[PDB]
Scaffold this motif. Structure first.
Motif, PDB file in Angstrom:
ATOM      1  N   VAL A   4      10.112  48.478 -16.466  1.00  0.00           N
ATOM      2  CA  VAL A   4       9.546  47.307 -17.112  1.00  0.00           C
ATOM      3  C   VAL A   4      10.360  47.035 -18.360  1.00  0.00           C
ATOM      4  O   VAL A   4      10.720  47.963 -19.089  1.00  0.00           O
ATOM      5  CB  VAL A   4       8.067  47.507 -17.463  1.00  0.00           C
ATOM      6  N   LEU A  24      12.333  40.364 -21.076  1.00  0.00           N
ATOM      7  CA  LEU A  24      13.509  39.592 -20.734  1.00  0.00           C
ATOM      8  C   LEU A  24      13.927  38.695 -21.886  1.00  0.00           C
ATOM      9  O   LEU A  24      13.089  38.176 -22.629  1.00  0.00           O
ATOM     10  CB  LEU A  24      13.233  38.757 -19.495  1.00  0.00           C
ATOM     11  N   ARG A  69      16.259  35.543 -22.023  1.00  0.00           N
ATOM     12  CA  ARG A  69      17.045  34.472 -21.420  1.00  0.00           C
ATOM     13  C   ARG A  69      16.575  33.147 -22.009  1.00  0.00           C
ATOM     14  O   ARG A  69      15.493  32.656 -21.629  1.00  0.00           O
ATOM     15  CB  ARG A  69      16.920  34.482 -19.903  1.00  0.00           C
ATOM     16  N   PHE A  74      10.348  33.089 -18.104  1.00  0.00           N
ATOM     17  CA  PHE A  74       9.979  34.453 -18.451  1.00  0.00           C
ATOM     18  C   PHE A  74      10.712  34.949 -19.689  1.00  0.00           C
ATOM     19  O   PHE A  74      10.944  36.152 -19.834  1.00  0.00           O
ATOM     20  CB  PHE A  74      10.233  35.369 -17.256  1.00  0.00           C
ATOM     21  N   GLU A  79       7.493  40.019 -20.046  1.00  0.00           N
ATOM     22  CA  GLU A  79       7.793  41.304 -19.443  1.00  0.00           C
ATOM     23  C   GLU A  79       7.969  41.145 -17.947  1.00  0.00           C
ATOM     24  O   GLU A  79       7.125  40.549 -17.272  1.00  0.00           O
ATOM     25  CB  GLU A  79       6.686  42.300 -19.754  1.00  0.00           C
ATOM     26  N   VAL A  80       9.066  41.685 -17.437  1.00  0.00           N
ATOM     27  CA  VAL A  80       9.373  41.680 -16.018  1.00  0.00           C
ATOM     28  C   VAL A  80       9.654  43.107 -15.601  1.00  0.00           C
ATOM     29  O   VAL A  80      10.092  43.935 -16.403  1.00  0.00           O
ATOM     30  CB  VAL A  80      10.561  40.764 -15.680  1.00  0.00           C
ATOM     31  N   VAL A  81       9.407  43.382 -14.331  1.00  0.00           N
ATOM     32  CA  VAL A  81       9.572  44.706 -13.763  1.00  0.00           C
ATOM     33  C   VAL A  81      10.703  44.639 -12.756  1.00  0.00           C
ATOM     34  O   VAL A  81      10.789  43.689 -11.971  1.00  0.00           O
ATOM     35  CB  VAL A  81       8.271  45.220 -13.128  1.00  0.00           C
ATOM     36  N   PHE A  88       8.275  51.980 -26.804  1.00  0.00           N
ATOM     37  CA  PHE A  88       6.904  51.516 -26.669  1.00  0.00           C
ATOM     38  C   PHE A  88       5.990  52.559 -26.051  1.00  0.00           C
ATOM     39  O   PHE A  88       4.838  52.687 -26.476  1.00  0.00           O
ATOM     40  CB  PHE A  88       6.884  50.245 -25.824  1.00  0.00           C
ATOM     41  N   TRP A 132       8.941  50.775 -20.378  1.00  0.00           N
ATOM     42  CA  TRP A 132       8.206  51.770 -19.624  1.00  0.00           C
ATOM     43  C   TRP A 132       9.012  52.147 -18.393  1.00  0.00           C
ATOM     44  O   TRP A 132       9.833  51.360 -17.920  1.00  0.00           O
ATOM     45  CB  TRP A 132       6.829  51.225 -19.249  1.00  0.00           C
ATOM     46  N   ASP A 178       8.624  54.373 -14.562  1.00  0.00           N
ATOM     47  CA  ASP A 178       7.704  54.897 -13.565  1.00  0.00           C
ATOM     48  C   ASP A 178       8.115  56.301 -13.160  1.00  0.00           C
ATOM     49  O   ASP A 178       9.154  56.487 -12.521  1.00  0.00           O
ATOM     50  CB  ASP A 178       7.680  53.973 -12.355  1.00  0.00           C
ATOM     51  N   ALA A 183       5.784  58.228 -11.454  1.00  0.00           N
ATOM     52  CA  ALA A 183       4.798  58.605 -10.471  1.00  0.00           C
ATOM     53  C   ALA A 183       5.479  58.947  -9.159  1.00  0.00           C
ATOM     54  O   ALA A 183       6.599  58.521  -8.880  1.00  0.00           O
ATOM     55  CB  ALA A 183       3.799  57.484 -10.263  1.00  0.00           C
ATOM     56  N   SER A 184       4.778  59.734  -8.353  1.00  0.00           N
ATOM     57  CA  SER A 184       5.364  60.274  -7.142  1.00  0.00           C
ATOM     58  C   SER A 184       5.809  59.170  -6.207  1.00  0.00           C
ATOM     59  O   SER A 184       5.108  58.175  -6.007  1.00  0.00           O
ATOM     60  CB  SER A 184       4.372  61.166  -6.429  1.00  0.00           C
ATOM     61  N   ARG A 237      -0.773  57.641  -8.092  1.00  0.00           N
ATOM     62  CA  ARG A 237      -1.680  57.047  -9.055  1.00  0.00           C
ATOM     63  C   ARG A 237      -1.276  57.312 -10.494  1.00  0.00           C
ATOM     64  O   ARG A 237      -1.368  56.405 -11.327  1.00  0.00           O
ATOM     65  CB  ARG A 237      -3.092  57.586  -8.841  1.00  0.00           C
ATOM     66  N   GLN A 244       1.226  59.048 -13.721  1.00  0.00           N
ATOM     67  CA  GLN A 244       2.595  59.233 -14.178  1.00  0.00           C
ATOM     68  C   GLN A 244       2.860  60.630 -14.706  1.00  0.00           C
ATOM     69  O   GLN A 244       4.022  60.997 -14.902  1.00  0.00           O
ATOM     70  CB  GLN A 244       2.930  58.253 -15.299  1.00  0.00           C
ATOM     71  N   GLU A 289      -2.149  63.119 -17.748  1.00  0.00           N
ATOM     72  CA  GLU A 289      -2.902  61.936 -17.360  1.00  0.00           C
ATOM     73  C   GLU A 289      -3.822  62.223 -16.190  1.00  0.00           C
ATOM     74  O   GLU A 289      -4.996  61.832 -16.200  1.00  0.00           O
ATOM     75  CB  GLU A 289      -1.934  60.827 -16.984  1.00  0.00           C
ATOM     76  N   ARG A 319       5.496  37.761  -4.615  1.00  0.00           N
ATOM     77  CA  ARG A 319       5.788  38.553  -5.791  1.00  0.00           C
ATOM     78  C   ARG A 319       6.015  37.666  -6.993  1.00  0.00           C
ATOM     79  O   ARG A 319       6.691  36.640  -6.912  1.00  0.00           O
ATOM     80  CB  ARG A 319       7.013  39.425  -5.577  1.00  0.00           C
ATOM     81  N   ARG A 348       7.537  37.934 -10.978  1.00  0.00           N
ATOM     82  CA  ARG A 348       8.575  38.739 -11.599  1.00  0.00           C
ATOM     83  C   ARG A 348       8.001  39.806 -12.516  1.00  0.00           C
ATOM     84  O   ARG A 348       8.733  40.702 -12.944  1.00  0.00           O
ATOM     85  CB  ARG A 348       9.524  37.841 -12.364  1.00  0.00           C
ATOM     86  N   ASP A 349       6.712  39.726 -12.839  1.00  0.00           N
ATOM     87  CA  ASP A 349       6.015  40.820 -13.484  1.00  0.00           C
ATOM     88  C   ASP A 349       5.472  41.845 -12.499  1.00  0.00           C
ATOM     89  O   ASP A 349       4.622  42.654 -12.884  1.00  0.00           O
ATOM     90  CB  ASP A 349       4.881  40.277 -14.342  1.00  0.00           C
ATOM     91  N   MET A 378       2.690  45.642 -21.880  1.00  0.00           N
ATOM     92  CA  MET A 378       2.313  45.722 -20.445  1.00  0.00           C
ATOM     93  C   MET A 378       0.996  46.470 -20.310  1.00  0.00           C
ATOM     94  O   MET A 378       0.832  47.565 -20.849  1.00  0.00           O
ATOM     95  CB  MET A 378       3.403  46.413 -19.633  1.00  0.00           C
ATOM     96  N   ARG A 434       2.644  47.831  -8.850  1.00  0.00           N
ATOM     97  CA  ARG A 434       2.001  48.829  -8.025  1.00  0.00           C
ATOM     98  C   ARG A 434       0.649  48.291  -7.608  1.00  0.00           C
ATOM     99  O   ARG A 434      -0.226  48.078  -8.450  1.00  0.00           O
ATOM    100  CB  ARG A 434       1.874  50.147  -8.785  1.00  0.00           C
ATOM    101  N   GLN A 487      -5.092  49.121  -6.215  1.00  0.00           N
ATOM    102  CA  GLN A 487      -3.990  50.034  -6.449  1.00  0.00           C
ATOM    103  C   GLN A 487      -3.289  50.422  -5.161  1.00  0.00           C
ATOM    104  O   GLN A 487      -2.189  50.976  -5.205  1.00  0.00           O
ATOM    105  CB  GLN A 487      -4.507  51.273  -7.167  1.00  0.00           C
TER     106      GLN A 487
END
Lengths: 386, 136, 78
Positions: free
Chosen positions: A56, A59, A61, A66, A70-72, A297, A357, A359, A361-362, A368, A370, A374, B85, B87-88, C1, C17, C32
């Motif tokens: 995450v 952006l 631009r 956007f 925030e974009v992922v 963050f 951020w 990821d 997680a598995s 579920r 991270q 948690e 989808r 973009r977030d 976020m 996710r 989820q």
RNA sequence: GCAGUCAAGCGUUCAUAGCGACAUUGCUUUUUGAUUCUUCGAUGUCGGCUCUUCCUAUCAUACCGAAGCAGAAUUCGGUAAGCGUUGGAUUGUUCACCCACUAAUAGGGAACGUGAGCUGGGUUUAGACCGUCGUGAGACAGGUUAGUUUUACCCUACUGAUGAAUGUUACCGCAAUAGUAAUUGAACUUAGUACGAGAGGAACAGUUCAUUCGGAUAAUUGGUUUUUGCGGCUGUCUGAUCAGGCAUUGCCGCGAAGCUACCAUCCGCUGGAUUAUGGCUGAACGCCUCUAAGUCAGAAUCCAUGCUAGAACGCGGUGAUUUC
RNA sequence: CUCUUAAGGUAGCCAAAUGCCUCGUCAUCUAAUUAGUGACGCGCAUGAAUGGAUUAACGAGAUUCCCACUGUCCCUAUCUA
RNA sequence: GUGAACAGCCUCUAGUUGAUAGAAUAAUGUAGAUAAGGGAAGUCGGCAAAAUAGAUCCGUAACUUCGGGAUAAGGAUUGGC
């Protein structure tokens, strides 16, 4: 006749032959044009693809919907332990191209790079570079003159490096060796830099830096003998079709009375050497640091390594390169990174990137959490724990 | 796409090929719309032109007023029902396909919209944003 | 976020996710995984599913969150 | 079918912006014929589906020139075939005709490409009906209905895959040759500006996105499920229970991993020589002239960079090279 | 009115499995229909046990449309023997 | 035994355990299946497949040779204790 309805060639006639590669390590067929003004450093690195994760970021631009939002994005991780320098060689120019005249090696070669010269190590005297090692110990005689030969000739100089495969969780033990072209200045200074770095390591921070666009060169995932429908992207013929529908009906005309090279045929899919450009580095990470996966963050001390490990690879205890998007190759595969052959401004190769951020997680499930802490704080105590 | 398009649109997945039917979310007197073209679509052999949330289409009305039936008119898609989808990272979908009747330069023949609409449609068609209550 | 919450299971949704379902009444459900999405479409009740936060609340499992309050015993002192 | 020459005239005026009668010269072989050379000890004769390549007489796109070109739209023409040229109703249809989108919805060839590639709707066996003709058996490019589509395991070619011999063996490499890929559009801004009486109404540069194509990938979403992984359900069998068998994977739900989708994500290079055309100097022709010598710039062109293989008889460097 | 036949096609029916011209004309169905249905009728060449016109039920008959359903298709992917 | 049922599915008596095997699990096939969103846009043609399905209760049109159409259409219920 005059095909009833026009449509484009299925596939690219430029990635032919769709044949298996000669090696698992793809070969850099072009390094950047040199500048004889900058200091001496490499143009490429070797690492091992680990997998992917999710990223995450905010952006930047000026003109997009956007912007400052925030974009992922998807990234891929390349385990890039420090790369050892063993030798250089000197390519000089001819009317028949560049040509090597000398290979200078280092004295002490490690038992993970002098396995690359064997196909059966478990039965061997190991007897490699034993005489080249005794070529030292008289001050510098037979080696310094070779290096002088390189200085006196050799418009191009290349450094032979080997990976430290024993730091990764792979079971291979046989380091990958490769030539990497230096694009500093003063070929004398190039070879002197090499001589200083013999038996010594180069980290990836010295080559690459954040927001740098690179190219990835790797052999792509193998899938085997495949049919024409998935290999070239042809239509499935209809249902009521005798002797198959996953085929190409017409493979040519009566005249020219031959099957043409341009026609889609069944064969190997994958294990091609591919070269994919303009992949932005989103992080350069150090194994001498916990909190590789932490940010400005988030600020939770976690590595880049997900829970349960990277699938089919392991952990990332070494350094690494987190680069945008999907690159050629599957996991556990030697990639070679390359600086770009051109300066791309483009307002997307200059976006300065700061992650929010990561990821962890598995990827062995619909993970579920991270972090195990948690997980423990959510689920509470269990029957196992006291 | 085109005339009344206030801005551009990111690609979002196609869910409404020609021959599809989507409900009519406005109050113009039409109950469903039947899609027969998509404005801005290309040309590939055997590919169906297919519409997405926010796209303008040519439609006919199959159920509704005789004043409106048996003629082709422009329309806009406001709900998709295919997952698309953002973009977030958000994949999202509605439970139905829906559009509105409109004129070529973006205005609606109706005055209100039942149910939610996509933000990617509100951004691109302001008269749809005006007569929309809930935007998701 | 933000870290949204699953509308069926109470799980935590991290970015990129799961899915989101906008119902015709303009209500937004967040899932989820395809498990909880499918149970929603199969219109099951989470108070009967045993792995959900709602079930565990309803059945007092992990119920050490809030215990009790005291009673006031004191004078005016003014 | 296509293109030229001439030019009486149309074009307010004016032959040649664009057209162009009376006449005439030609090209082509995607028309139809003419002919009967080949084939009757059989070359599978419509059409569509599929797929490739080629041509250009260019529909669109790039660059230009001319206009009865103010702008906008349009017409004529050149270099150009690099890249594209659709979705449907009806019809067996080729052809055609309409709806709609589009940048455009150009024409053709390859044994009227393509049936051991499909299909078999049509024509073109045998069944059957009608109408007309015939005394009649029967006839009808007159309609209608039903009507078996064989074989590749050989050679070549193609796609992929090995491999003897070059002292052996191993590692790193060079790069002849061959191929080649990117394409198109919208919105914002330029600007309601230039132009124009007004109505109307641009363009370059820039930014964001999208179309078609292609190469990868699988973090996420989705699909797939013999993980026969977890649970559930039926019927029967194992005396009941627990645990299980059979139901040609019994069924239902969830379902990791792997595979995979414009149903998902990422990526898709910059330099030189030119074409048309516009020019410089500059004679020929004491003037003039892009041209004759010379030379400038310049297209989606061409060649490189880059990208794909790597000559199994093209090459180089380097390591180690066997004794009872 | 005229020529003329042994008589000159009546009742009915129709671009129908019969209509060349023909994708006939009008309407309806469709966004769009050489299809379909309903009407019209100088019908190349309909028509009365060569049976005509109808007709409920029946039809592995031919045909069109609607709903439902769907990998037929957009556009392909995965799995088992 | 289930069940309306010498249906299909499991079992007892009796009878077979025969049909060239092994190892892997590429394309293409044959047989069998599944599929987001759409829903016949596919094709000569909805070919093929899906969907429907039993029983109980309700409700049931045009037309008709009054006998039918008719399981019309279309809806609801179903377990165990």
């Amino acid at each position: 006749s005059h095909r009833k309805y026009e449509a484009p060639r299925h596939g690219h006639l430029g990635f032919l032959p769709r044949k298996r590669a000669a090696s698992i390590r793809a070969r850099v067929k072009a390094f950047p044009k040199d500048d004889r003004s900058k200091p001496v450093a490499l143009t490429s690195f070797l690492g091992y693809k680990a997998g992917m994760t999710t990223i995450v970021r905010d952006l930047d631009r000026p003109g997009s919907k956007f912007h400052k939002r925030e974009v992922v994005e998807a990234v891929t991780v390349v385990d890039t332990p420090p790369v050892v320098v063993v030798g250089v060689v000197g390519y000089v120019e001819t009317p028949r191209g560049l040509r090597s005249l000398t290979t200078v090696w280092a004295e002490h070669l490690s038992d993970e790079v002098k396995r690359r010269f064997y196909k059966n190590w478990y039965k061997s005297k190991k007897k490699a570079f034993t005489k080249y090692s005794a070529k030292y110990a008289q001050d510098g005689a037979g080696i310094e003159r070779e290096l002088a030969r390189i200085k006196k000739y050799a418009s191009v100089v290349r450094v032979l490096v080997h990976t430290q495969i024993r730091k990764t969780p792979l079971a291979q033990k046989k380091a990958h060796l490769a030539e990497i072209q230096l694009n500093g200045g003063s070929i004398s200074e190039k070879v002197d830099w090499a001589r200083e770095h013999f038996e010594k390591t180069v980290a990836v921070d010295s080559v690459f830096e954040q927001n740098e666009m690179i190219d990835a060169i790797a052999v792509t995932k193998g899938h085997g003998f495949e049919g024409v429908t998935h290999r070239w992207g042809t239509k499935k013929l209809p249902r009521k079709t005798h002797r198959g529908l996953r085929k190409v009906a017409c493979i040519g005309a009566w005249h020219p009375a031959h099957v043409m090279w341009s026609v889609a045929r069944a064969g190997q899919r994958g294990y091609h050497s591919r070269t994919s450009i303009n992949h932005k580095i989103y992080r350069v990470g150090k194994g001498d640091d916990e909190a590789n996966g932490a940010t400005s963050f988030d600020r939770t001390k976690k590595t880049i390594t997900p829970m349960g490990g990277f699938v089919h690879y392991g952990e990332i205890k070494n350094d690494f390169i987190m680069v945008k998007g999907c690159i050629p190759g599957n996991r556990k595969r030697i990639v070679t990174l390359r600086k770009s052959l051109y300066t791309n401004t483009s307002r997307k190769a200059l976006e300065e990137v700061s992650l929010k951020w990561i990821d962890t997680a598995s990827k062995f499930g619909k993970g579920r959490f991270q972090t195990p802490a948690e997980k423990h704080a959510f689920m509470g105590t269990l029957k196992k724990d006291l | 796409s085109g005339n009344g398009a206030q801005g551009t649109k990111f690609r979002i997945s196609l869910g409404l090929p020609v021959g599809a039917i989507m409900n009519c979310a406005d109050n113009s007197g039409a109950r469903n719309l039947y899609i027969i073209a998509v404005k801005g679509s290309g040309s590939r052999l055997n590919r169906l032109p297919a519409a997405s949330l926010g796209d303008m289409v040519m439609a006919t009305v199959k159920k509704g007023k005789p004043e409106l039936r048996k003629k082709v008119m422009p329309a806009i898609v406001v709900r998709q029902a295919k997952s698309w989808r953002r973009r977030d990272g958000v994949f999202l979908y509605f439970e139905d396909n829906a559009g509105v009747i409109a004129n070529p330069k973006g205005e609606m023949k109706g005055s209100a919209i039942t149910g939610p609409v996509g933000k990617e449609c509100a951004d691109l068609w302001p008269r749809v944003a005006s007569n929309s209550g809930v935007v998701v | 976020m933000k870290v949204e919450i699953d509308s069926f299971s109470g799980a935590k949704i991290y970015p990129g996710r799961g899915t989101l379902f906008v119902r015709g009444d303009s209500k937004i459900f967040r899932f989820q995984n395809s498990k909880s999405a499918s149970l929603f479409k199969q219109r099951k009740n989470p108070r009967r599913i045993a792995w959900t936060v709602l079930f565990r609340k309803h059945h007092k499992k992990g119920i050490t969150e809030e215990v009790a309050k005291k009673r006031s015993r004191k004078t005016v002192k003014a």
